[PDB]
Every structure is written in structure tokens, then in C-alpha cells.
């Protein structure tokens, strides 16, 4: 299953990265009652909240974040949203290692480095979700943008496990 594992890792990395940039770029993270200028149903993202019913259909402005040191640190991280963006870079760095993996067969650390990048990126997503949820709370529903980030975490962990498996079996074959 050596061929399918590499194809799974290469396909999975592209799926995890593409879902991440769409989740960050799009603004359907949360459905809430608010104003995009009375208040109406709105769909909120990481940077913009926009109403989806009423006379202001589709028109919207940037989300303000700053309206208590612990609250300031949570708001600063949430306003910057570095963790979801950090997960985008780690997928990008992890994808490059997998692409460069099929070039340098002699160096077996490049594929393991990709595995660490995918595993580390998933930890940046769950910490990004907790920061986003905690700041949101401090009725609603989650759109497909939030679930894209949730599904980008599961795929990143699965590809990381497969990437580590590929490296481990290579050292097992070298030891044999």
C-alpha cells in the first residue's frame, strides 16, 4: 500500500489546505441577529458580518472587535485571528514538504517534517476554534465556513498520521 499512502497524503494535504483558505476567506462562520449598517438575521465571518435578510441584503462592513488583561489578550488574539491564519501557513509548509518529498528520496526527514507540520497545524486549529467560540460568547448557529475549519482539522490529523507511517516504514526497511 506504499503507492496509495503517498497518493492519500498528497490528495489529503490539498483538501486540508483548500478547506482552510475557504474557511478563513468566506464569511459564513456564524448566523446571528445583528446590524450590517433595527437589527436582523446576519451571517458573520472572521472579518466581516453581513445581513442575509432585509433591505440591506448582502451589503456589509468590517467587524469591529475593540468596543481586563485576560479579556484584552483573548480579544487581541481573536481580532488578529493568528491561530486560524497560522494553520494556513503550516498546511502550506506541510504541502511543500510532501511535494519536495518525491524529489529527495535520500533524505527521509523531509516526509517526517511534513507529518509534524500537519499534526502541529491541527493543534493550531482547535486552539483557534476555542478562541473564536470564547470571544463570540463573551440564539446562533454555525454555517458551513465554521464546519470547513472543523473538517480541515480532522483531515490534517489523518494525513499527519499517514505521513508519519510512511516515514516509519521507510526506516524499518532501511533497518532491514
Amino acid at each position: 500500500d506504499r503507492g496509495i499512502q503517498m497518493l492519500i497524503t498528497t490528495v489529503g494535504a490539498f483538501a486540508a489546505f483548500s478547506l482552510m483558505t475557504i474557511a478563513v476567506g468566506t464569511d459564513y462562520w456564524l448566523y446571528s441577529r445583528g446590524v450590517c449598517r433595527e437589527e436582523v438575521m446576519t451571517h458573520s465571518g472572521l472579518w466581516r458580518t453581513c445581513c442575509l435578510e432585509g433591505a440591506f441584503r448582502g451589503v456589509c462592513k468590517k467587524i469591529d472587535h475593540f468596543p481586563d488583561t485576560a479579556e484584552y489578550l483573548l480579544r487581541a488574539v481573536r481580532a488578529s485571528s493568528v491561530f486560524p491564519i497560522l494553520s494556513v501557513t503550516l498546511l502550506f509548509f506541510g504541502g511543500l514538504c510532501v511535494a519536495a518529498s518525491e524529489f529527495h528520496r535520500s533524505r527521509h526527514s523531509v516526509i517526517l517534517s511534513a507529518g509534524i507540520f500537519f499534526v502541529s497545524a491541527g493543534l493550531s486549529n482547535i486552539i483557534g476554534i476555542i478562541v473564536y467560540i470564547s470571544a463570540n460568547a463573551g440564539s446562533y448557529s454555525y454555517g458551513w465556513s465554521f464546519y470547513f475549519g472543523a473538517f480541515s482539522f480532522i483531515i490534517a490529523e489523518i494525513v499527519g498520521v499517514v505521513a508519519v507511517h510512511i516515514y516509519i516504514e521507510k526506516h524499518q526497511q532501511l533497518r532491514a
Partner: protein, 41 residues
Amino acid sequence: KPGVFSFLDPLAYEIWMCIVFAYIGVSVVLFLVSRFSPYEW
């Protein structure tokens, strides 16, 4: 009428989602640090 799946009421649905995410993350990391090391294996 106690609705079905009411035993999950004490913890909000946000916690239940993040517990599954935390469980998957811990399992992968524990496997990563215990299997990737030549000295350990």
C-alpha cells in the same frame, strides 16, 4: 417530556465538539512522540 439525548445537557454542545477534537489531537500527538523516535522504537 425529558427529550432523548438529554444526558448531554449539562455540558454545552460546544464542549462536546471540542472534547472530540481534543481526544483526536491527544491520540495523534501521543502516537507521534512514542513511535517516531528511533531510540523509543
